[PDB]
Scaffold this active site. Structure first.
Site, PDB file in Angstrom:
ATOM      1  N   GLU A  58       0.917  -1.248   0.104  1.00  0.00           N
ATOM      2  CA  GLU A  58       0.113   0.017   0.058  1.00  0.00           C
ATOM      3  C   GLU A  58       0.982   1.239  -0.037  1.00  0.00           C
ATOM      4  O   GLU A  58       1.921   1.201   0.781  1.00  0.00           O
ATOM      5  CB  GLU A  58      -0.971  -0.012   1.325  1.00  0.00           C
ATOM      6  CG  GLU A  58      -2.022   0.992   1.386  1.00  0.00           C
ATOM      7  CD  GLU A  58      -2.650   0.843   2.471  1.00  0.00           C
ATOM      8  OE1 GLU A  58      -4.029   0.813   2.316  1.00  0.00           O
ATOM      9  OE2 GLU A  58      -2.199   0.619   3.798  1.00  0.00           O
ATOM     10  N   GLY A  59       0.433   2.250  -0.626  1.00  0.00           N
ATOM     11  CA  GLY A  59       0.930   3.675  -0.662  1.00  0.00           C
ATOM     12  C   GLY A  59       0.070   4.758  -0.175  1.00  0.00           C
ATOM     13  O   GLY A  59      -0.852   4.353   0.567  1.00  0.00           O
ATOM     14  N   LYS A 105      -3.814  -4.206  -8.234  1.00  0.00           N
ATOM     15  CA  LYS A 105      -3.572  -2.908  -7.805  1.00  0.00           C
ATOM     16  C   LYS A 105      -4.956  -2.084  -8.137  1.00  0.00           C
ATOM     17  O   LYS A 105      -5.516  -1.916  -9.208  1.00  0.00           O
ATOM     18  CB  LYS A 105      -2.503  -2.215  -8.552  1.00  0.00           C
ATOM     19  CG  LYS A 105      -1.884  -1.067  -8.056  1.00  0.00           C
ATOM     20  CD  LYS A 105      -0.651  -0.414  -8.589  1.00  0.00           C
ATOM     21  CE  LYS A 105      -0.148   0.772  -7.818  1.00  0.00           C
ATOM     22  NZ  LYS A 105       1.192   1.274  -8.350  1.00  0.00           N
ATOM     23  N   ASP A 153      10.888   5.945  -9.282  1.00  0.00           N
ATOM     24  CA  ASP A 153      10.836   5.288  -7.707  1.00  0.00           C
ATOM     25  C   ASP A 153      11.523   3.827  -7.747  1.00  0.00           C
ATOM     26  O   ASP A 153      11.112   2.914  -7.324  1.00  0.00           O
ATOM     27  CB  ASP A 153       9.398   5.015  -7.524  1.00  0.00           C
ATOM     28  CG  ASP A 153       8.855   4.472  -6.144  1.00  0.00           C
ATOM     29  OD1 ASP A 153       9.743   5.017  -5.309  1.00  0.00           O
ATOM     30  OD2 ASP A 153       7.684   4.180  -5.803  1.00  0.00           O
TER      31      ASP A 153
END
Ligand code: R4S
Length: 287
Positions: free
Chosen positions: A17-18, A42, A135
């Site tokens: 989770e972000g 996702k 990222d």
């Protein structure tokens, strides 16, 4: 193009989770028998704004066109009626991220260098498709088996504009960022190479939390700095201060990390230059 029918999706567990997305493991069993597939799904949080919602459709598009052995497999999409968008369906990478895997499994130098090489192959491929990752960290590198690693998330990935060499937030992975990103707000292909050097550092520390880039950089900056963490980070990097040499890291591999960490982005190797070098250093340590 492939559509997943929600009627066959049974949630097993959360995988990550972000701030605006979530990955969960599902069983996709259009029976109830043993022909069932394991999938990573996702989803964008229903509260996400228009900027994140338009960036989500862009993420899905990027994964639909990316095909490489060292990049997570796109499986399909399904209507996310509760979030009123789409859900990204990908293959389930069985061993998880290197961030979660490495602190529990003592892995040899040669296997880490092989992973390092595979990340480069996947990244050189990404750069040839004119995309920047933004990222690249051990948390986004997924282990399929002891010899196969994949870049498993593309949440921040952007297409580099046609007549430009770079692409112009509290959720930004600043401790994996080149000074040009922090200072000039410009992300180049070379900016991903800096991040790779930080990911290679993580691998060589077996993703130990007490050796992590935020832990290590926050010990150098201190914690009573107000809104000045990023400012103070920009200046230690400009004085040539860097993440230490990980215990058990060869001098040569550490020099390579330092070369990915050149302040002058033009002095950094590309991911294409890194591939034959990593092949060679790996063959050495493998024997
Ligand atoms: O969670 C996120 N992105 C990814 C990279 C994270 C893990 N994810 C995936 N993980 C796996 N497999 C697996 C197995 N175990 N565990 C947990 C330990 O690591 C994850 N497969 C596919 C994936 F797509 C996707 C965004 C912030 C939401």
């Amino acid at each position: 193009p492939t559509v997943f029918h929600k009627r066959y999706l049974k949630k097993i567990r959360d995988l990550g989770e972000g701030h605006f997305g979530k990955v969960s493991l599902y069983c996709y069993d259009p029976t109830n028998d043993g022909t069932g597939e394991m999938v990573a799904v996702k989803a964008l949080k229903a509260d996400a704004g228009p900027q994140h919602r338009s960036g989500w459709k862009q993420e899905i598009d990027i994964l639909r066109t990316l095909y490489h052995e060292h990049i997570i497999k796109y499986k399909g999409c399904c209507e996310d009626a509760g979030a009123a968008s789409l859900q990204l369906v990908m293959e389930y990478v069985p061993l998880g991220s290197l961030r979660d895997y490495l602190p529990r499994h003592s892995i040899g130098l040669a296997q880490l260098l092989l992973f390092a090489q595979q990340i480069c192959e996947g990244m050189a491929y990404l750069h040839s498709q004119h995309y920047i990752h933004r990222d690249l960290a051990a948390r986004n590198v997924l282990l399929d088996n002891d010899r196969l690693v994949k870049i498993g998330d593309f949440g921040l990935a952007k297409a580099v504009p046609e007549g430009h060499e770079y692409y112009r937030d509290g959720d930004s992975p600043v401790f994996w960022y080149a000074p040009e990103c922090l200072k000039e707000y410009k992300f180049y292909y070379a900016s991903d190479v800096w991040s790779f050097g930080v990911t290679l550092y993580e691998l060589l520390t077996h993703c130990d939390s007490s050796q992590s880039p935020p832990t290590k950089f926050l010990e150098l900056i201190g914690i009573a700095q107000g809104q000045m963490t990023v400012l103070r980070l920009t200046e230690l990097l400009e004085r040539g201060e860097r993440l230490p040499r990980p215990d058990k890291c060869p001098a040569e591999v550490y020099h390579l990390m330092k070369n990915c960490w050149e302040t002058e982005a033009s002095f950094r190797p590309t991911f294409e230059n890194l591939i034959p070098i990593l092949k060679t250093v790996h063959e050495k340590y493998q024997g």
